[PDB]
Structures are given as C-alpha cells and as structure tokens.
C-alpha cells in the first residue's frame, strides 16, 4: 500500500500531499534540530516560536516556459515577510532554522521536461560589473519571495552603479562553476514523466550555531530546467512552479525593536 | 627525566619536555596557571555582601 510516490507532510496548521513524489532528500543525511547547550553561544533564553512560524508558506508561483533559464531564492530571505516567521526573524538579532522545501510542478503524461532542484549552502553569486568585484546591493541580493531568474547571457554594466545585481548566468550557476556539477549539492529532479514534486529537508548549515538572518542567507534554492519544457500541441504553453517552504526548529536570540531593512 | 603534558588543543595531544640546563631561569615558559581571585580587587570588603541581600542594611 505505502509508496515512495505518495507522501503527507504536516507542520503546524499546514499539510502538503503529493501522489507523484520521488522519495524525499534529507540534506547531508541530517534532520534539523534545536541548538544543544554544549554547542550554544548567545546566553539569553531563546524564543522557540514552534507552530506560529514552523509551518508551510507558499511563495508567488512562477511560469515555466520553453525559454525559461531558471529561478533562484535565498533562505531565510524568501520567508522574511511570511507571517510570524518574518516577525520573529526581524524582532531578533539572531536566528537559526531548518526547512522543508516542497517544489510543485504538475503537467500531463504528454508534456516533457526536467527541473533540477538544488539546496546550496552559502550560495554566493557573481556581480554584474567588471569595474568592481563583490559589488551587489543589499536590495538586489535580498529580493524576498519573488526571488530572481537566471539568464543564458552575461552583459556586465558600463557603469559600476548599474551592475550592483547578480550575473545569474545559468551554465556557470551564477558563480563561476559548471551547472552540471550542482548535483554535489542536496537535490531532487522533477522529471515530468516521473514526478510532480521535490521535497528537501534542510538542517541549519553555517560555521556558527546561530547568525544574523537579516545579514546572511544560509541556503540558496536553485531551480534549473535541465531539459526544456516541451508540449507538441502548443510549444508556447506555460506550467506553474510553486515553492512552499516550512521553517523547522526555529530559535531566536537578542530581542529588541524590529529590524526594518532598506528598500532602495 | 622527561615531562609529558597536555598540549593546548587546535583545530581538531601530549608533548614532551626535557630541561637541558642546570638553572631554572633557562627553562621555557611556566605551565598555564588558571589561578584567579578577582574578589581581592572587585570585593575587598570586611563584611560579606550577599548579592541577593541589600548592600546596606
């Protein structure tokens, strides 16, 4: 009866079902957990918001077209405006979180295409000016739930001031490595003939027990079309990709007034 | 007359000392001494002060 294709995930007041899964990945074989006393750093009693924040948040959907080059998000950036998770994140200097990432993309038995879904620790990307190095604005690095897109062309700006964004070049994974090697990162593939969803469970990953969520993204989420969307009756068809992410084992330290980041 | 002692831990562990000289002045640094009594400077008071009690009763 039980199947690698059929899964239920419940966190807080939220449940996901899938009937065409392909198992689930636990990044580096490690389930998320709370911070042990023997690895702790800040000494204030932490906030552990539990079900208020540790629940599935669904981002705005994106459209997969035959011409799409791919999509990226950063975490916890993508969830910074999500209910009580966002409030706990911005009221505290420090936060840590694992995640359940659920990527959703259904089609038909007559569609074809394959998405690589990669969870990348410290997903540092190239800037878009050759007048400077490491020259990216906070606003362009932290787009929130809209994330960003890859391009198949690199056109760095004439003026340094116009190039303060990522050069998200697909085949170099936006960071000077070949995209074919992205499989060293925790991943699944959504191959439309096989599966309609990817599930990645991510532990907290950092060189520290806990860090400034508003300064630092622990994970990149990359969705690359490895094989282009094709549908014989309409080559210009679009199918949605929906990203749903639950924080897990969230813990916050250093309560004060709320952080309100710059928007320009 | 070799002395075997614990090393200070690194990134990831005993070491051996033999004294070669007849004068202790020739010896390498004294072993780590973690002794401390801050109270002789931070609380040099005649009558014990219990933190939870009033300083002046």
């Amino acid at each position: 009866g039980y199947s690698d294709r059929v899964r239920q995930i419940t966190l807080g007041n939220s449940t996901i079902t899938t009937q065409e899964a392909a198992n689930a990945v636990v990044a580096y074989g490690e389930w998320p957990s709370y911070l042990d006393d023997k690895e702790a750093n800040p000494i204030d009693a932490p906030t552990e918001p539990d079900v208020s924040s540790n629940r599935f948040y669904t981002l705005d959907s994106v459209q997969w077209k035959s011409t799409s080059r791919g999509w990226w998000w950063k975490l916890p950036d993508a969830l910074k405006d999500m209910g009580m998770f966002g409030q706990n994140m911005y009221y505290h200097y420090l936060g840590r979180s694992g995640y359940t990432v659920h990527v959703q993309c259904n089609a038909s038995k007559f569609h074809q295409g394959a998405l690589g879904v990669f969870a990348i620790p410290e997903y540092v990307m190239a800037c878009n000016t050759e007048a400077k190095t490491s020259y990216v604005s906070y606003v362009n690095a932290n787009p929130g739930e809209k994330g960003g897109v890859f391009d198949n062309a690199y056109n760095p700006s004439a003026e340094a001031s116009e190039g303060r964004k990522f050069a998200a070049l697909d085949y170099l994974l936006g960071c000077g490595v070949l995209a074919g090697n992205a499989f060293v990162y925790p991943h699944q593939i959504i191959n439309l003939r096989t599966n309609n969803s990817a599930t990645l469970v991510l532990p907290y990953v950092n060189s520290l027990a806990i860090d400034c969520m508003a300064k630092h993204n622990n994970w990149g989420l990359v969705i690359l079309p490895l094989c282009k969307l094709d549908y014989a009756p309409n080559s210009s068809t679009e199918i949605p990709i929906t990203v749903t992410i639950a924080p897990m084992f969230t813990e916050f330290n250093g309560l004060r007034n709320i952080t309100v980041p710059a928007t320009q | 007359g070799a002395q075997v002692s614990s090393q200070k831990v690194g990134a990831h562990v005993n070491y051996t000392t033999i004294n070669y000289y007849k004068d202790s002045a020739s010896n390498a640094a004294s072993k780590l001494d973690f002794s401390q009594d801050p109270s002789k400077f931070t609380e040099p008071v005649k009558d014990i002060m219990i933190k939870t009690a009033p300083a002046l009763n």
Partner: peptide
C-alpha cells in the same frame, strides 16, 4: 578550567534584589 557557564533561569518576583548594590562599599 573555563570561563563561567550560564545557568537556565526564568523570571522572579522577589524581595531578593541582586540588581541593586552600593559601590560606596568599594565593591
């Protein structure tokens, strides 16, 4: 020998007032 660990503590509502002192004492 290590620097001091922090114990688990919650709040108080008490006649014990460790926040107040008198540095006139020389402490």
């Amino acid at each position: 020998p290590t620097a001091q660990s922090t114990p688990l503590t919650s709040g108080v509502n008490s006649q014990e007032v460790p926040a107040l002192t008198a540095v006139e004492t020389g402490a």
